[PDB]
Design a protein around this ligand. Structure first.
Ligand code: HEM
Ligand SMILES: [Kr]
Ligand SMILES: [Kr]
Length: 148
């Protein structure tokens, strides 16, 4: 595949520091959709502001979890079938915690934003398209968890 290599090569730099890069993605997410902030309840409390979430070890742990799932999508970029079941159940979990399926589009824009900022001139239109397709397929798999 051509695009599989585009994903592999562009993930290499980001994957060296997943928490740093993940923090960009979530900062961008709350700037676009602040109504997602209350969905992260740790120790029975709601974060008041987006900067509150960045001081929470549990929230930062979830950033690393998100990045590891994306790492698994890249590893299986040539055949995402083998992750379908895991992704479906991850969708069910997120539905249970209160995330609306449509919020995953904003997550996609946040991921693309983070890649654009990290890669700079190396974020070619083919690289955007490749990532849009891969994230699209991840979300399709996850969408099964919302009653099908
Ligand atoms: C809309 C943005 C998202 C919100 C509000 C959200 C929120 C949550 C919450 C509340 C949990 C349960 C508490 C925890 O363990 O932290 C969770 C778990 C988790 N999240 Fe997310 N999440 C989002 C996006 C994602 C995405 C896009 C991925 C995939 C790349 C992901 C990967 C994971 C994983 C692997 C877990 C552990 C699941 C388990 O207990 O089985 N998260 N998330
Ligand atoms: Kr954040
Ligand atoms: Kr992805």
């Amino acid at each position: 595949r051509p695009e599989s290599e585009l994903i592999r090569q562009s993930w290499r730099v980001v994957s060296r520091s997943p928490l740093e890069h993940g923090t960009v993605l979530f900062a961008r997410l709350f700037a676009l959709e602040p109504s997602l902030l209350p969905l992260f309840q740790y120790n029975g409390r709601q974060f008041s502001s987006p900067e509150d979430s960045l001081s929470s070890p549990e929230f930062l742990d979830h950033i690393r979890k998100v990045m590891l799932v994306i790492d698994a999508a890249v590893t299986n970029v040539e055949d995402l079938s083998s992750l379908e079941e895991y992704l479906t159940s991850l969708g069910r979990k997120h539905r249970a915690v209160g995330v609306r399926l449509s919020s995953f589009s904003t997550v996609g824009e946040s991921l693309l934003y983070m890649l654009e900022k990290s890669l700079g001139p190396d974020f070619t239109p083919a690289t955007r398209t490749a990532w849009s397709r891969l994230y699209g397929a991840v979300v399709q798999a996850m969408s099964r968890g919302w009653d099908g």
